[PDB]
């Protein structure tokens, strides 16, 4: 969308981190199954590279674009000014906590 690209960006983080898997073993035993194309979602895939974890590393960027969002957002207070710094803080620890 022309202007307001920044909101489009904060929005993109939500876009899933998995791959579609088509029920093959289940399709084999027959098994009931509504839709005539039993493929489904797996939330996050496996970890191919030896140390990187495509999945958690992704959340890491999320804490920045997000953390970054916390800097654009300014305030008008002492309480608001303070907690903002430290949450910039909690927000980060939270992410290594996630890795």
């Amino acid at each position: 969308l022309a202007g307001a690209n920044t909101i489009i960006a904060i929005m993109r983080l939500f876009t899933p981190q998995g791959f579609l898997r088509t029920d093959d073993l289940a399709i084999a035993a027959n098994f009931p199954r509504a839709s005539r194309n039993p493929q489904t979602y797996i939330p996050y895939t496996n970890q191919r590279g030896t140390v990187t974890n495509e999945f958690a590393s992704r959340f890491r960027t999320i804490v920045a674009t997000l953390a970054n969002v916390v800097n654009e957002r300014a305030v008008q207070d002492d309480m608001q000014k303070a907690t903002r710094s430290c949450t910039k803080q909690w927000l980060r620890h939270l992410e290594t906590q996630f890795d």
């Binding site: 303070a82 907690t83 430290c86 803080q89 909690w90």
Partner: protein, 49 residues
Amino acid sequence: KRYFPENLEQNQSAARLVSAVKARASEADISSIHLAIAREVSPMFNVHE
């Protein structure tokens, strides 16, 4: 219970935040966590609200 970097709970200024997250976050219910996961894959019959 393991929240914030602990020291944050202790800091004067942060407690304002120590608080939002504290209230937002709950208690690990043995029950809610499996159920939470189970609905990821199971049929949908009510349109979750």
